[PDB]
Amino acid sequence: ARGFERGLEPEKIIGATDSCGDLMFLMKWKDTDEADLVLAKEANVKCPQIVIAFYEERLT
Amino acid sequence: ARGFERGLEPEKIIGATDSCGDLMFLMKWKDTDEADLVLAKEANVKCPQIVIAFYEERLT
């Protein structure tokens, strides 16, 4: 049971990689310290403001 | 001239600049070649998937 399947609230994306062919985000979930990979596509649609916060922080 | 006030659908963000202290996007609107500066904060809320497509392309 991983990523969104864990049923937790998204908190913060801490990294991204397309190294596997598909863009994936490393998601920090609310009230756990076990982070997981989720598809960018699914995060884009389910928590778009959290995705944007990640990209805006990455701009500087 | 007016940006979102023009009542056009966002097509794509051409680029982004913080050169004014606030993050701004240069927005291409559908069916117009007149691009406009809009606040990132406003695009984030009104057309988040257009913002994300811009950032995803820039990540490559």
Residue numbers in the entry:
A (entry chain A), B (entry chain B): 114 to 173
Question: What did the study's authors say about this model?
Answer:
HP1α contains two folded domains, chromodomain (CD) and chromoshadow domain (CSD), which are linked by a hinge region and flanked by the amino-terminal and carboxyl-terminal extensions (nte and cte). CD binds to tri/di methylated lysine 9 of histone H3 (H3K9me3/2), a major epigenetic modification and a hallmark of heterochromatin, whereas CSD mediates dimerization and associates with various proteins through recognizing the PxVxL motif, also known as the HP1 box. In addition to supporting the establishment of H3K9me3 as a recruitment module for HP1, KAP1 contains a HP1 box (KAP1Hbox) sequence, which is recognized by the CSD of HP1α (HP1αCSD) in biochemical studies. Each HP1αCSD protomer folds into a short N-terminal helix α1, a central three-stranded antiparallel β-sheet, and two C-terminal helices α2 and α3.
To determine whether conformational changes accompany the complex formation, we obtained the crystal structure of the apo-state of HP1αCSD and characterized 15N-labeled full-length HP1α by NMR. In agreement, the crystal structure of HP1αCSD in the apo-state showed that the HP1αCSD dimer is in contact with another HP1αCSD dimer (two dimers form an asymmetric unit). The dimers interacted through their β-sheets (protomers of one HP1αCSD dimer are colored wheat and grey, and both protomers of the second dimer are colored yellow). The β-sheet binding interface was comprised of primarily hydrophobic residues, such as I126, I127, A129, L136, L139, W142, A148, L150 and V151. To determine the role of the β-sheet interface in oligomerization of HP1α, we mutated L139 and L150, identified in molecular dynamics (MD) simulations, to glutamate in HP1αCSD and in FL protein and tested the L139E/L150E mutants by NMR and MP. In contrast to WT FL HP1α, NMR resonances of CSD in the 1H,15N HSQC spectrum of FL L139E/L150E HP1α became detectable, indicating that mutation of the β-sheet interface residues L139 and L150 disrupted the formation of higher order HP1α oligomers. Collectively, these data revealed that while HP1αCSD forms a dimer through α-helices, HP1α oligomerization involves the β-sheet of HP1αCSD. Overlay of the structures of HP1αCSD in the apo-state (yellow) and HP1αCSD (pink) bound to KAP1Hbox’ within the larger crystal lattice showed that while the protomers HP1αCSD1 and HP1αCSD2 of a dimer can be superimposed, the protomers from the neighboring dimers were oriented distinctly differently in the crystal structure. The orientation of one of the neighboring dimers in the apo-state structure was opposite to its orientation in the complex and overall, the neighboring dimers in the apo state structure were not superimposable (Fig. 6a–c, only one protomer from the neighboring dimers is shown in (a) and (b) for clarity).
